Design a protein around this ligand. Structure first.
Ligand SMILES: O=C(Nc1nnn[nH]1)[C@H](Nc1ccccc1)c1ccccc1
Ligand SMILES: O=C(Nc1nnn[nH]1)[C@H](Nc1ccccc1)c1ccccc1
Ligand SMILES: O=C(Nc1nnn[nH]1)[C@H](Nc1ccccc1)c1ccccc1
Length: 263
């Protein structure tokens, strides 16, 4: 049903993209689900999944320490700036990237994977032909209208998230670690999580470009007594000065309602 989403995005003053999947029944909710939206920091969830995939062929990868200096620091590195010189393990960097959106951590891990093209290669390997990362933090946040760099679609985000958290794309230990990192995210309390009852489990990764009304969140949600739901909510707006969380929460509420999920 497009009517409620159309009213929401008109009130917002931009475009809202939603794809939600009930993994039990297969029912879906789609609104602008195949349009490209900027990933912004939301790429960092898939980055951590790619690191975990690498751990399936490199023993002890997650506990390997990476040393870095002031030169590795990027604005908004709230974890990595505290562990300078002495460095952090690959697992610590991955958790910081997912749960605090740490920019230096993300760029360090990106470097280990061969840059944006290496993360894109990992997404291709799990069957995602839509995702593309082209740049690093912070340039990937430009969110220019019509620019395909550093974008995906809500549908492709949800499908890949499902494969990685609930399907067979990662081995079982790596899958659970990915879920656990998403569950511990600290940046999403006002987005999808605000639409989810307190007694349901949720893991998410947010993104905020800071321009063009562009922000997003994707999540796996475990209601009690039924199969998990996977969903993605992305926004953008036509003007650079347009502001982007309540709209994301409202869109998530509508998506769950459209799936018949009482919550
Ligand atoms: O967990 C692994 N592998 C696996 N488990 N399930 N599927 N692959 C091992 N990696 C790993 C990564 C970080 C920390 C500890 C272990 C591993 C990789 C390669 C050879 C042998 C072991
Ligand atoms: O540098 C290190 N440890 C150290 N520095 N000063 N005192 N201990 C390295 N371990 C490490 C472990 C976790 C986080 C950061 C660094 C290391 C130890 C041994 C061989 C190679 C690397
Ligand atoms: O919001 C951010 N990161 C993030 N949000 N969700 N996940 N990560 C960062 N600050 C921010 C806060 C409010 C509005 C705009 C930006 C940030 C994003 C992009 C460039 C520079 C800084």
């Amino acid at each position: 049903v497009a009517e409620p989403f159309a009213k929401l995005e008109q009130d917002f003053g931009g475009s809202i993209g939603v794809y939600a999947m009930d993994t039990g029944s297969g029912a879906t909710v789609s609104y602008r689900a195949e349009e490209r939206f900027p990933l912004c920091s939301s790429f960092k969830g898939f980055l951590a999944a790619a690191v975990l995939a690498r751990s399936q062929q490199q023993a002890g990868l997650l506990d390997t320490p990476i040393r870095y200096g002031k030169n590795a620091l990027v604005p908004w590195s709230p974890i990595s700036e505290k562990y300078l010189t002495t460095g952090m393990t690959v697992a610590e960097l991955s958790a910081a990237a997912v749960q605090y959106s740490d920019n230096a951590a993300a760029n360090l891990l990106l470097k280990e994977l061969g840059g944006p093209a290496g993360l894109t290669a990992f997404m291709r390997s799990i069957g995602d032909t839509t995702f593309r990362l082209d740049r690093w933090e912070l340039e990937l946040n430009s969110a220019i209208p019509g620019d395909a760099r550093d974008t995906s679609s809500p549908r492709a985000v949800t499908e890949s998230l499902q494969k990685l958290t609930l399907g067979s794309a990662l081995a079982a230990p790596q899958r659970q670690q990915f879920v656990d990192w998403l569950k511990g995210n600290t940046t999403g309390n006002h987005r999808i999580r605000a639409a989810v009852p307190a007694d349901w489990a949720v893991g998410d990764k947010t993104g905020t470009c800071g321009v063009y009304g562009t922000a997003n969140d994707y999540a796996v949600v475990w209601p009690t007594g039924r199969a998990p739901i996977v969903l993605a909510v992305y926004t953008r707006a036509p003007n650079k000065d347009d502001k982007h969380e309540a709209v994301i929460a409202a869109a998530a509420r509508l998506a769950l309602e459209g799936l018949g999920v009482n919550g």
